Write a protein that binds this DNA or RNA. Sequence first.
RNA 1: UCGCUACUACCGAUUGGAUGGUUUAGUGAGGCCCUCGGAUCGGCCCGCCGGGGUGCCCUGGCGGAGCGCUGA
RNA 2: GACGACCCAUUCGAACGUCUGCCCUAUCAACUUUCGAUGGUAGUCGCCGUGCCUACCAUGGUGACCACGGGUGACGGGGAAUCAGGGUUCGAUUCCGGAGAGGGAGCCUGAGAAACGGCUACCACAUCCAAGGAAGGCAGCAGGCGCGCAAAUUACCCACUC
RNA 3: GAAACUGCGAAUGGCUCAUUAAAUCAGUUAUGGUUCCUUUGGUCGCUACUUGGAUAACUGUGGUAAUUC
Lengths: 206, 60, 263
Amino acid sequence: GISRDNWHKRRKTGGKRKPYHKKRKYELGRPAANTKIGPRRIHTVGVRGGNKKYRALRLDVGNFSWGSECCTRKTRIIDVVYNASNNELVRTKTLVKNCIVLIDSTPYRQWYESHYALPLGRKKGAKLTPEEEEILNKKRSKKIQKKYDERKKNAKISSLLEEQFQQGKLLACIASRPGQCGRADGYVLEGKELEFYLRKIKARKG
Amino acid sequence: MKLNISFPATGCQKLIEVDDERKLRTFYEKRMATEVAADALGEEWKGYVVRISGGNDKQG
Amino acid sequence: MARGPKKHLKRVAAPKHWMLDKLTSVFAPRPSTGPHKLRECLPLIIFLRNKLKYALTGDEVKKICMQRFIKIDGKVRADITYPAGFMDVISIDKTGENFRLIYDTKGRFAVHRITPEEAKYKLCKVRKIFVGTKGIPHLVTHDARTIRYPDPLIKMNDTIQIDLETGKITDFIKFDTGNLCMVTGGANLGRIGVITNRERHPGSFDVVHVKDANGNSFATRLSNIFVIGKGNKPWISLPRGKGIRLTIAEERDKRLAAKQSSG
RNA sequence: UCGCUACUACCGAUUGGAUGGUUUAGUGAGGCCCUCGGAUCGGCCCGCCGGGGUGCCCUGGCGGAGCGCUGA
RNA sequence: GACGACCCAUUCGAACGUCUGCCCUAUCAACUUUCGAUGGUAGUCGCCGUGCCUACCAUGGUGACCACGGGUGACGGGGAAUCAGGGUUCGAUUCCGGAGAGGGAGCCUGAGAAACGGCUACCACAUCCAAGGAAGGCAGCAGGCGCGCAAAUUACCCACUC
RNA sequence: GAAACUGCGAAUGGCUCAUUAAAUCAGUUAUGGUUCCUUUGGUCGCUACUUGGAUAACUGUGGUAAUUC
Ligand SMILES: [Mg+2]
Ligand SMILES: [Mg+2]
Ligand SMILES: [Mg+2]
Ligand SMILES: [Mg+2]
Ligand SMILES: [Mg+2]
Ligand SMILES: [Mg+2]
Ligand SMILES: [Mg+2]
Ligand SMILES: [Mg+2]
Ligand SMILES: [Mg+2]
Ligand SMILES: [Mg+2]
Ligand SMILES: [Mg+2]
Ligand SMILES: [Mg+2]
Ligand SMILES: [Mg+2]
Ligand SMILES: [Mg+2]
Ligand SMILES: [Mg+2]
Ligand SMILES: [Mg+2]
Ligand SMILES: [Mg+2]
Ligand SMILES: [Mg+2]
Ligand SMILES: [Mg+2]
Ligand SMILES: [Mg+2]
Ligand SMILES: [Mg+2]
Ligand SMILES: [Mg+2]
Ligand SMILES: [Mg+2]
Ligand SMILES: [Mg+2]
Ligand SMILES: [Mg+2]
Ligand SMILES: [Mg+2]
Ligand SMILES: [Mg+2]
Ligand SMILES: [Mg+2]
Ligand SMILES: [Mg+2]
Ligand SMILES: [Mg+2]
Ligand SMILES: [Mg+2]
Ligand SMILES: [Mg+2]
Ligand SMILES: [Mg+2]
Ligand SMILES: [Mg+2]
Ligand SMILES: [Mg+2]
Ligand SMILES: [Mg+2]
Ligand SMILES: [Mg+2]
Ligand SMILES: [Mg+2]
Ligand SMILES: [Mg+2]
Ligand SMILES: [Mg+2]
Ligand SMILES: [Mg+2]
């Protein structure tokens, strides 16, 4: 079937080479996965030596990380925004390594408000009266100075990141190959990477 | 065509030959694993329910 | 043609230090996978039926081994193509005799009966020192043995004497200039001497010099040195000749002048 | 030079033939992958009986309903 | 004791790479390139490195020191015949390596196969049929037809080597 | 102890030289860029006095000109 052999190529001089043998099995095919977004399905391929290998199709949940905070959570993947290799991989919402994805951003908000005792980007406060000010402004006399005042000074999320938390989504990069592992892990963009990718996105579409 | 009747209660089988197509009209155009009333195959068969389980073509 | 691993060995392609004929047949024992490499081992059938003449065919050595008589390094081996190798100990207690496979002088194994008190330990060369989970130091010796928790001052190319019954490294000799050694590969396969030098070529094949007990010098690669003593004092018992390699002229003079024909 | 016999190679209408090797364009068996498909086969949940307990429950069996969920 | 088993090391390998080494031919002097040619970035796939393949860029790469094309009654080597010194010719063939099972192609199982003493199709042959259907691969050992100037028994045995 | 289920082997060996001209192959090195049944050595603790249904062989009825159907 499909083959990865070197012997169908021209040699460096531009000359043809003639084959000496039929196609082997250590030179195999196995067409692409083309992971979409949706309810999970994962098939399993038997490869050289045994060693099953998981090929994902329609993943919808990932394990992403925030490196400044060292805080990693399970999250939902919403959409793909950028793709350095092709552009038809954003029209079809296929999810490959080094893609740029939107995630749900909620568990990071939960951990942040719980760890710092301080809010994210919030517009108005009425929902904070029955609940959430319960977490953020917890009724305790011990700790609530000594601990959380050492949590403060450090709780200075940058302009772009705190602007992200308002619309309820983030920008993340996949750092794992879902076609080989069946997992869509990665890390949320920050700093100059975030600026570069935001400018690229703004420049491409529209 | 012939039939191979099997009673899974007492463990007894018997082959039967039936030529007149009228008796056979009960089974025509009916896939395997469907139960029918075999009381059309005779008068000893009155309150009988049979399940088709397979067979062989001409040429086997 | 060759879609998998092979399992036959032709008599003409077998190692030469087995000292086989060329008229018995097309085939050779083909030692089974073990702790010693294929070209550097000595199967059980060849050691028993060819060097010891205890057996006369392959059936006889099979039915000698199938009676739990032969012990290699303490344990009872039932296979007749087991790859016994350097510094091993054979034990046949039905007759009360123990041997030790060591190259004599001419690049082949000898028959080297030893005392039963000496057939308890064996010397092993260290090839690898790595750390496992939870920071446990491991060893790897020249015969695939793995030792956990060695004292953290034994390194590569050092020799360790181990008890055959329990593992449990007992003592060790250090690779240094001045230590007795036997060469276990190449052209000087069998000669014994002191180190006196170690040339170093970063990236490939650091060579080592040797000078035996008669002022003769010869070099080898570091991959073939085997420290067997502190210096001028072996830890295992040396065979007859003691790796001296007297030349063909001296060979002829000693074979003629002694008139070694019979008793 | 012309003439006789014999042998060899050449040009050539025949728009020759045989065997092939590439090859535009069109079709395309069969396997593999993906998205569907759903012939059939079971389990779960409710009465009567047999076995155990407190009119009901548990294994099982029977006829069945809802065939509702459900797995291959 | 037997068996089984995740992982690491060892053994037996397998695969992909480095440097150097080749018969005749110019009545073969320029070749290669969206039908990847040479390189760059991101990926797909693969046991893994890699234009292996895709997207976007750059315009490169080889050659008179013989590239590129053609021929070989060319499998390579260890080796064989001849030989003052140098050389010339041979190596289908018992050891090592490669390739194939009528010709191509595609797969299952498996640690390991693109396996043919396995399977599925097309082409070429060819067998039985109750004409609906079924079955095939001796470049294994014997044997047979054909081809030729040209090459053996349809024998006995696992006693030896494995 | 027949048969049958199960485990393993059938990728070795044997044969031939059609293809193949930096291809194979030979000496030399590299996997710090990979996989490896088996062998040898290390590793084995974060209704339980033992669970479920269901197929062979075997018994019995058959189909086809014909098969290791
Ligand atoms: Mg070929
Ligand atoms: Mg494995
Ligand atoms: Mg072979
Ligand atoms: Mg063997
Ligand atoms: Mg004439
Ligand atoms: Mg054509
Ligand atoms: Mg097509
Ligand atoms: Mg198709
Ligand atoms: Mg690239
Ligand atoms: Mg890459
Ligand atoms: Mg150019
Ligand atoms: Mg050329
Ligand atoms: Mg050519
Ligand atoms: Mg040829
Ligand atoms: Mg030649
Ligand atoms: Mg000469
Ligand atoms: Mg040859
Ligand atoms: Mg030929
Ligand atoms: Mg021959
Ligand atoms: Mg090779
Ligand atoms: Mg083949
Ligand atoms: Mg043929
Ligand atoms: Mg297996
Ligand atoms: Mg094939
Ligand atoms: Mg074969
Ligand atoms: Mg067959
Ligand atoms: Mg055959
Ligand atoms: Mg023949
Ligand atoms: Mg003739
Ligand atoms: Mg002749
Ligand atoms: Mg003849
Ligand atoms: Mg035999
Ligand atoms: Mg028995
Ligand atoms: Mg086995
Ligand atoms: Mg197998
Ligand atoms: Mg022959
Ligand atoms: Mg050529
Ligand atoms: Mg080369
Ligand atoms: Mg080589
Ligand atoms: Mg080489
Ligand atoms: Mg083990």
